[PDB]
Amino acid sequence: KKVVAVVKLQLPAGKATPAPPVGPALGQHGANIMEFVKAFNAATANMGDAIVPVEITIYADRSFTFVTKTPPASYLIRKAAGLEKGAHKPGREKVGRITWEQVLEIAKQKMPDLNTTDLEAAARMIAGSARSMGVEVVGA
Amino acid sequence: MKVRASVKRICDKCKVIRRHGRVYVICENPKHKQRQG
Amino acid sequence: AYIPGEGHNLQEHSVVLIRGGRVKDLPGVRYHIVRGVYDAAGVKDRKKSRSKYGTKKPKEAA
């Protein structure tokens, strides 16, 4: 018997394998993580991928439950500002440009994940995290 | 290290204790077991 | 020791059956090799000289 274990991970969409540490954490669970793969992939079917957090539990009598979250902002800018892998080193080379609407949605999408669950900080917040990956900005 | 003329504080988790007459340098991992000698 | 021609492996033991018979080649060619012996078993696929060239009875199963 095994009483309650809610272990949450960082499993991206695409990998349909029980490879450790998914093993030594959800073996003591009886985890239906093959249903987590085939129900969450279609959950974000509009793209069908991207790195997404998860959370899975056991109810004594083997009962899974999947809890999904939202994409990363470094990827939600490679799609936005059109990077390939990025702008090779944040302090030398720059690709596309951020202005006054793309960053808006970079903050919009990730409204309840960033830190300050308030819009009136997020924009400039990750616009500053933009210089961390090296994507330039257009300022008005 | 361990017995030598030059004996530093090297890793911050070390102390210089002028014990039994002469300077030592003791820590946890006695691989820095220095000593003025 | 020479050999029975095409299709060899032999490496370095084989029990090459010292046979006997020179030619206008290799100033010796005396005491040949046989295939079948303790090694070689003839050409990979032979249809005649299977009296030395290993291969048993091409039983092509048809």
């Binding site: 394998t17 490879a19 450790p20 | - | 490496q11 370095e12 033991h13």
Partner: protein, 549 residues
């Protein structure tokens, strides 16, 4: 000290997936041993001493009893994963009939399900009779082992039946040396009656066989039997050809063969080189009774170097085989390190004059060849080009002027080895009627190549292997350590089943006898496969270090 139950039990469903139901519990831990309780047939077989001259079986000495009882109950309840009587019996609270235990248990046992951890002690004769009884209770009979697999005289499936009337059909194993009755073959038949003093025939490489006398190693002394039965085991005399694993039927016995084909794969590679090669073919006779007594090892010679590589699967393996050498075969061979297949190349575009401005008797044979040379990737192949600046050098040299290039390539400018993995090119030349031959521009090519390779930025491409590491995560971290410490860098880690295999790059010179290592770091979780990839440069210092003389 250390003797226990829970110990081993616990370590059974943490190291495989065992389902250890157990049937006997000791009396007194360490030094205080005196007997065992039997939660199987509900008894307490107690051995009142060490040597075991005088024992007993009184009930529980007051404190155990109910302890054992719980586990007894476990048994029955566990037996709810088999039939339908035992399960419903636990439902009823009904008492198990002493033999349904024998059932359900032996059932699962032979069905590979339950784990009759019968146990005891040897040096102090304590706990032997119970497991003798437990062999005569829960240890599978040939009747229980499902249909043996095998081939036919033609080729499909076999049905090696128990039936003591069917066609003669045997297998044998051990190659016994012995004084009186000489070569003795240790065998397990299978299916078919075999008479003593009769005939048979080897169903493998085709060899009629004369059975001399069937024998049986009866502990102390060996006993000669009238015949071997279809499903028994015995060792016969004669058969002066039959090696090991040879399927042996009767004189008729529809010339049937068997399936089973095992694998003693290689892991060790030690070099060995006698003083003078006169003692060598001598040691080849030594092998002529070494690689013909113990299957296993592979006595195969590397091409690029001399000396036959004695390969095998075990450190102590090759070491003790080597013991037997100087022992009773007596060979003087300073057991060396395995050599490596060294190649080479260059790293730059070179242009020189291959002018053979040499008249002799009047026939000349002179060749001014004008090559441009280009080098390319470690893995491509060999390239040259039909590269005439317009139409100078004759077309008879096209398939020959490149020969001397390919020829002055079997030995490089350094220590000299086959210089591969290069393009080449050419571009021009000089021509004359009688003062020019095929081999002349072959040799002009040779000169051109020696100059253009000695002056072309040298190198040595030592070979390197891809080695998958068959081991779980612990010692995986550890061995990522090791491999990294072996001048190479791995590259590979796809999560595996009961382990996690790591695809590795390791420089063939290094990684030497890695099994001798590995089997120590991992304690023995598994090992590796020898997948060979390709070659690349040794870090500067390793190059000039080999520049000997």
């Amino acid at each position: 000290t250390g003797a226990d139950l829970w110990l081993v039990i616990r370590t059974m469903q943490e190291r495989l997936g065992a389902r250890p139901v157990v049937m006997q519990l000791p009396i007194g831990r360490e030094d205080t041993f005196s007997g065992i309780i039997d939660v199987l047939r509900m008894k307490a077989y107690t051995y009142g001493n060490d040597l075991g001259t005088d024992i007993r079986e009184i009930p529980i000495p007051e404190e155990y009893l109910d302890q054992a009882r719980e586990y007894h109950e476990k048994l029955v309840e566990v037996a709810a994963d088999f039939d339908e009587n035992i399960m419903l019996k636990y439902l009823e609270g009904e008492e198990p009939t002493e033999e349904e235990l024998v059932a359900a248990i032996r059932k699962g046992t032979i069905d590979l399900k339950i784990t009759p951890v019968f146990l005891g002690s040897a040096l102090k004769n304590k706990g032997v009779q119970l497991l003798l009884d437990a062999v005569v209770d829960y240890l599978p009979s040939p009747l229980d082992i499902p249909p043996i697999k095998g081939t036919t005289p033609e080729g499909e499936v076999v049905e090696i039946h128990p039936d003591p009337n069917g066609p003669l059909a045997a297998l044998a194993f051990k190659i016994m040396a012995d004084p009186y009755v000489g070569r003795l073959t240790f065998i397990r038949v299978y299916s078919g009656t075999l008479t003593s003093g009769s005939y048979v025939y080897n169903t493998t490489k085709g060899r009629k066989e004369r059975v001399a006398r069937l024998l049986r190693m009866h502990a102390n002394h060996r006993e000669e039997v009238e015949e071997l039965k279809a499903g028994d085991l015995g060792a016969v005399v004669g058969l002066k050809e039959t090696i090991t694993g040879d399927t042996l039927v009767g004189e008729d016995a529809p010339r049937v063969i068997l399936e089973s084909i095992e694998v003693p794969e290689p892991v060790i590679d030690v070099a060995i080189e006698p003083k003078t090669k006169a003692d060598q073919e001598k040691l080849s006779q030594a092998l002529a009774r070494l690689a013909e007594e113990d299957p296993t090892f592979r006595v195969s010679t590397h091409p690029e170097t001399g000396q036959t590589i004695i390969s095998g699967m075990g450190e102590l393996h090759l070491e003790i085989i080597v013991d037997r050498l100087k022992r009773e075969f007596k060979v003087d061979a300073n057991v060396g390190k395995p050599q490596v297949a060294y190649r080479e190349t260059i790293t730059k575009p070179v242009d020189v004059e291959g002018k053979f401005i040499r008249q002799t008797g009047g026939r000349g044979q002179y060749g001014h060849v004008k090559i441009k040379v280009e080098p390319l990737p470690r893995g491509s192949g060999f390239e040259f080009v039909n590269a005439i600046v317009g139409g100078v050098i004759p077309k008879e040299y096209i398939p020959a002027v490149q020969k001397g290039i390919e020829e002055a390539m079997q030995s490089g400018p350094l220590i000299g080895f086959p210089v591969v993995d290069i393009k080449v090119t050419l571009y021009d030349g000089s021509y004359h009627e009688v003062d020019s031959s095929e081999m002349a521009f072959k040799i002009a090519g040779s000169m051109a190549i020696k100059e253009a390779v000695q002056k072309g930025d040298p190198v040595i491409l030592e070979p390197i292997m891809r080695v998958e590491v068959t081991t779980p995560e612990e010692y995986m971290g550890d061995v990522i350590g090791d491999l990294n410490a072996r001048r190479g860098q791995i590259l590979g880690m796809e999560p595996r089943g009961n382990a996690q295999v790591i695809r590795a790059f390791v420089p063939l010179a290094e990684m030497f006898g890695y099994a001798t290592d590995l089997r120590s770091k991992t304690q023995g979780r598994g090992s590796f496969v020898m997948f060979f990839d390709h070659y690349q440069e040794v870090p500067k210092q390793v190059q000039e270090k080999l520049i000997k003389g």
